[PDB]
Symmetry: C3
Amino acid sequence: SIEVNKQSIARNFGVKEDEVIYFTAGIDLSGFKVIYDESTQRAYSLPFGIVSGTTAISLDERAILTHSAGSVDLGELAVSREEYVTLPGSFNFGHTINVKNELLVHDDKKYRWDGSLPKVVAAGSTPDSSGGVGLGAWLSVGDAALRAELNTKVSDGTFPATIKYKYGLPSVIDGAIYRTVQDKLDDFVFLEDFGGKDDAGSTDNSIAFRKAFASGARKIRLRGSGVYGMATRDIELPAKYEIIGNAKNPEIKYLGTDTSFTMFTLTGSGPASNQWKQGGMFRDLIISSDVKINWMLGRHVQNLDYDRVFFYNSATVLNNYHYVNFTRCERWGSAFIGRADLNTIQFISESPKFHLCFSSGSPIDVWDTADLAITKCTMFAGDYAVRTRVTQKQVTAPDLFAGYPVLITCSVFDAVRGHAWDLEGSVYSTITGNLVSAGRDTNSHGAYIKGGRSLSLTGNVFTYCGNYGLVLEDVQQSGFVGNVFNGNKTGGLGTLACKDLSIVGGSMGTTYVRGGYYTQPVGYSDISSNSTGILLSGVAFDEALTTKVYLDTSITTRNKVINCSGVPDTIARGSTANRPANPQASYQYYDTTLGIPIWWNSVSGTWKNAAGADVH
Amino acid sequence: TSIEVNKQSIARNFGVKEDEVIYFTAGIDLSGFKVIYDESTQRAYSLPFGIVSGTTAISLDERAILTHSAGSVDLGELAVSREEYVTLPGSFNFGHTINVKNELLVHDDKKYRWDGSLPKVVAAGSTPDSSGGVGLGAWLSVGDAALRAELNTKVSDGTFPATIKYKYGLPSVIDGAIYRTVQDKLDDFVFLEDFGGKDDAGSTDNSIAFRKAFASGARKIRLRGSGVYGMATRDIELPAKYEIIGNAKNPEIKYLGTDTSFTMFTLTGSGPASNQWKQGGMFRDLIISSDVKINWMLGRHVQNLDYDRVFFYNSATVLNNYHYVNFTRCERWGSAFIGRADLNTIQFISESPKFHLCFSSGSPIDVWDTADLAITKCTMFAGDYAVRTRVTQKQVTAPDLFAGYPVLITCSVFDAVRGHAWDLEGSVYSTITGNLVSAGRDTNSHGAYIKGGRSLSLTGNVFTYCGNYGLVLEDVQQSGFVGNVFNGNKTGGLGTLACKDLSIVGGSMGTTYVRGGYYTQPVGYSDISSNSTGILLSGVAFDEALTTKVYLDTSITTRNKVINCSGVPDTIARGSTANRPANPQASYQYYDTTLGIPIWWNSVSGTWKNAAGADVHHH
Amino acid sequence: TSIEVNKQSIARNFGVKEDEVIYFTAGIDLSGFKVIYDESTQRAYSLPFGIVSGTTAISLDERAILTHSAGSVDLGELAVSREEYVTLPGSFNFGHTINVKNELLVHDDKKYRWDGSLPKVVAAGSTPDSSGGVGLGAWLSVGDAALRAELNTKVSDGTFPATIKYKYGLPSVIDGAIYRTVQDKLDDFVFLEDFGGKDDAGSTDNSIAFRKAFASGARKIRLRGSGVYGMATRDIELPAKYEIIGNAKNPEIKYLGTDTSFTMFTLTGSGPASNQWKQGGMFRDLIISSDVKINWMLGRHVQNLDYDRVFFYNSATVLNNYHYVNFTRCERWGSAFIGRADLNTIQFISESPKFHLCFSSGSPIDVWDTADLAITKCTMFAGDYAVRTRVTQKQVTAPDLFAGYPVLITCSVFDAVRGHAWDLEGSVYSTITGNLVSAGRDTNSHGAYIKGGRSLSLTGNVFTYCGNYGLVLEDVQQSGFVGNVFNGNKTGGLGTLACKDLSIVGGSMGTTYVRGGYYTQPVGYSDISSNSTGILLSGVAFDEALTTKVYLDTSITTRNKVINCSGVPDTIARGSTANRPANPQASYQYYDTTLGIPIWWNSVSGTWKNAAGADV
Ligand SMILES: [Cl-]
Ligand SMILES: [Cl-]
Ligand SMILES: [Cl-]
Ligand SMILES: [Cl-]
Ligand SMILES: [Cl-]
Ligand SMILES: [Cl-]
Ligand SMILES: [Mg+2]
Ligand code: NA
Ligand code: NA
Ligand code: NA
């Protein structure tokens, strides 16, 4: 019966029986709310835009209702009103869609087709394999689909890029732009983002660094407070890295037993300045190893920084390096090794600098390096503190000597087993205001300069050293003013084969201050009596010193003492044959052949005695 | 039976039994049934649970309120609770009346119900917002299309982060941790990118991004990129206490134009007094660059500025009336520091620009009217000069004799500078200690030149391979020069012009022929124009091969005197009988060139005697 | 028939054709039909697609399990997959029995289906959580109301960030990047605000926020705000290796009360030994302040503390038994540093407080029993004094003669201090180089005062316009003073009291009348009480206008001796026969005032000779 069918259709759409009609080519649609196609057995809501007299024309399988007025897609209107038919079966069985309001199930979720009809779906299809999802293709419909899509997006990583973010909302801030939460979160990189974990050896964080750097990331932070094990050697750093610890809590640590293991490399492409790789910063972290390693190897590099780094058994090795700063670092069993033989052009490295560092058992060993500078540092114990060497050495006339400057200022060197300073090839150096107490364990000088030229060593204190406080060997044309040499085992200041040095002011002796000293037996000694041009002026010697000065001050040596306490001013004296050849006017000479003083008279051009008589 | 057929199709619709559907009729017992039908309205509604036997139907209105024996029930309300709805034929656009709570009206392919009082009339061309809004007591959206559109809107319009509650550490419960929003937590940091910044090499004007970020109240601003942030709008005023942080020295803030008068940033106090100086801030870990030479920052009436790990390229820093500025771990290429004080109309002095651990190439430091410039542990290479000081007000009035200010230069290296490494005018109370200077070769200039100096100390420096003298002092007085080395300079080691009361002690002069460069220095110390007085040389170790070790007039009236300088005569007391000193110290020894003998002043006899103790003739 | 009619009604509901609906009857061929009807339960169900011809029906139970000749199918499960549901009468609160997977039961205007064993009896008064829970195998929410409510709860209850998966760089696929959660990524950083901190000027007690933040294990804590964070609970103990980071020096951590005994933070080791010292941390980029004077931090038994770009106001730092502490780029206003060591019951010493690039006004540095205080590149203005050192344990036993410690003061400026710039007691091995001092004018005090000094060097400093002497040395021995300038001081340049064996070399004294302030200095160098010995002046350039250049007893027994100081006579060896030196070097020259002649020593004969060679 048509009446009962119209009636149950009315119940479905929530309308009145009076308001339903069968499509019939020639009816006045006006007034009806729902139309029924008896051929397809589908019902459709009618557009509110229906005027009396508009009569049917043709109603097709696509539910396109052609009437007198114009035409209407009843399927499209049905989607608009969320009035759907869920087809039997599924994408897997396949089916054909003819109307915009037909749904097809895939995996317990429904889809409608937004493209051209009819749409045939072959058996074994999925929405993706049959047009994909989007405007003009498959669009998901309904509860199950929305739930799955939300669960999937939240759980698969895609959600943060779909959330728009703007700084300061809900406040409207002039100039703030829309970004995504993904973008904003990506403003920072932690090692953890690349699988890093401070789990004390379970994770190989070497690979996390490698991957992080390969992504283009440069500034990498450590979240943890524990030990990040490193197990793959020779990770190459990118130019201008910055690795940031969590407030000096976490360690980047090698936990193995291979002393050849190296954590990181930094490598330029060749020896010239345009080939040096730009370094970066390590800060606020511990670099450590249970065995001694060279933790980083830099070759052909410039502008490296380490700030607030704690190094444990981890030596830094650089070869052909240019400007490196260690600031506020703590170095335990962790040497600095600088070389330049890879610089095949000039055979030089430049400016390793240490500021506000503390070191224990951590020597600084630089060869063929210009302008090593150490300022406001404390170095404790170790075999030695500072060593310099020159491996070129062999000069060609008119050059007479090869070497480089160090600058060492207001630093403390204490309880070093050997020399605090073992400086070979020191040229134009300035060494000012330091405290040195070293060498006791090996009966070594506190400081030893072998091969020095044109340098200044000013205002330093050498105390309680294992031999001399300071020994100068093969040093020329250099100044030593205001230095104190106290309580040293064998002597204060010693020279060997030096030439043209000034030793001015300061003081030598023993002051017996609580905390350690020897009774120093010698002040200044030219130990092998073979220096010339050594000038001592104004030095305050402790009267109790057994030997204040040992120095040959005979007339041809050019060695001379003036106003040094407990030592006479050098007197020109000698035999008649050793009278000077070109004396200044009124020159006074004590003639040991005659046993009298004599004076050079420049007008007569003769030596005379005190009574005015010519001698000779 | 048509009633029965209708009852049946309704039972199918609700999933109930056929006999559980009842028509409304006044008086009928409602117990047991599940669904009631209104024959007038032609609507069905689920009945509420628990209608006990005896309850009889009384009335049912167009709003689907059912009245019965034991009370009443809003069947529209019940239907909403069970998500049992009717979608009316219209839309908000054609207009409709809403009579019951479970009727839905379509707006833009989405459904809404009315949560207000009923009936609800809706004129054509209405919307949920125009007809009472959306929320409790008004329109509430219902169903799939609505929820999908609202979620899409929410997620895409920026409001979502503020709705997500966040607490640090969850799901762990951390004592003291508070609830915030994701929005809040994300806003804890500001990147230039948040205000439109982009390192796209000139497409974006990042000057505006800085201006907008600062105006928001942001102070600490980070750069995310590794490329070039182009700057195209001049004179962006910095707030007090900014911090601009680059991405590990990778990105550049760069001027790409051709106007050499462009300036990126200004920092400007409100006047010249200390409580009016604007508090500066920090630039760190980045490159400040320009293709043409510019003054990239101009500070006027400012205090407490820091630059740390900044690489400057063609970018000069210009400050006028400034107080305490630090450059630390900077790399300065073609990038001058220019300090002035004429805007300080109170004292006309600026204070304490300080450089530490810097490397400079072609980047002079040029300060006028500035007290306590300090350079420590720095390297300066090339350039026209490295350090220049000047005093504008060379205007003193007696009893004042001189005007100037101190510099402190310590353990720094100045190398291959084309002119003077140090060009110091008006240098007073300065300390210059432990430095290396090799400068002036390209222009035949002194390594260092002090013109107008008072009461200063220059100690333990090395001047080597300089283009004229290592160091020249002109109009310097009451100053000490101890332990300095002067090696292999073109013309001489140390020179004086019109100086007074200087001590030159120790150190050494000569040439040591070290591989890397030197001249054969022909002169040690020279009083170049023979017009200085009170110049005291003591204990200086001269290379014997020096042609002229000392050039100095040591006659009695000059007060110039030499003692223990190798290869140089000591200044001896000597002269004619007429020139015997008038008030000699006790036992004074004088070589009398008239007599050709030494004589001694005896303070007891009050006479000059020879060595035999006889008085010499003396009127 | 009514069966025909019911089938038609059902067909409309499912959107199928009338002949595609079938009643379950045992034995029927099921193929071809789309919907089946159970006439007993009066429920309809979609049939699964593709039942093959000849598949005959066996049974259909109250669970809607359809058993047939080829197998069985759960039509309830299929209904769920197609979102074809029945909403039961009633609710969880009234109770019900669930028999089929596609039955829904309402609770709180939301629907649930049962995913567990059927049937499921729900007792009256139930809720989903009370009647089995929500999740797989239990209750599962269905539909619009439920989903809306669940979305609102999940965003608002704090659990959402941990549910959102995150990976760095998406949608780009970055090798090595791992999945984390948004919660994890946000938790990478800690602000004080996360623990309730607020810069609301006293309303919030931020002391407690810090306590809670550190108790969580967090170490690096950031301040978001630019205002005042009030602190109201005293003695918050810092963890080891904290880092507190201000917002670019804008915010203040401030005490707003009136109790001068209030202390913000403590850092406390477990005892005096090196393995018991607590590792400190960093404060940076912030203001520490109080309206009344307080000791804002108290450190006891501590090592490795840093303060960088901190502005201190009325806030003294007090450390007792401390080892290595750095203040860099700090501004100190009315904010003393107080260093002590009496809590070190082992050695009674503290070590290496260091100041670099600091500015201070009215903020003295007062350290007792402390080795190696170092001040470099600093400026100190005003205050009662700038730098003070003291020794508590002054008494010594033979062979010790003296107790004290080094200070290192380099290239720093001390100006307009009311009393002494430097008040140094027990100064041993100190190096004081390249400083500028102008102090004491307000109290007629010396610019610098060293009382008890040994084996130290003071080089290349300038002392100008001080309130008495530029520098006074009292009880100083075996020390060097080279290249210093003493200008324009009220009473004198350099003074000594009870000293022994000092060298004073070069530099200059006088007044240069430079605009900006000076006195007319009346005295150069003075041995003020005429009781020092072994004082050696060499090469000092004195202003000719000085009224008294040198005040010093240079008689033969005092070992005091002047050479080449302008305007001062050179010291001549002279005196009575009784005071002739015993056994001096050969040809030593002495003016014998008893005989009124010079005489020369002949070492071999052990006799004095006159200039004619005769014994005297
Ligand atoms: Cl990062
Ligand atoms: Cl690699
Ligand atoms: Cl003569
Ligand atoms: Cl602006
Ligand atoms: Cl006499
Ligand atoms: Cl606590
Ligand atoms: Mg129906
Ligand atoms: Na290796
Ligand atoms: Na307290
Ligand atoms: Na007295």
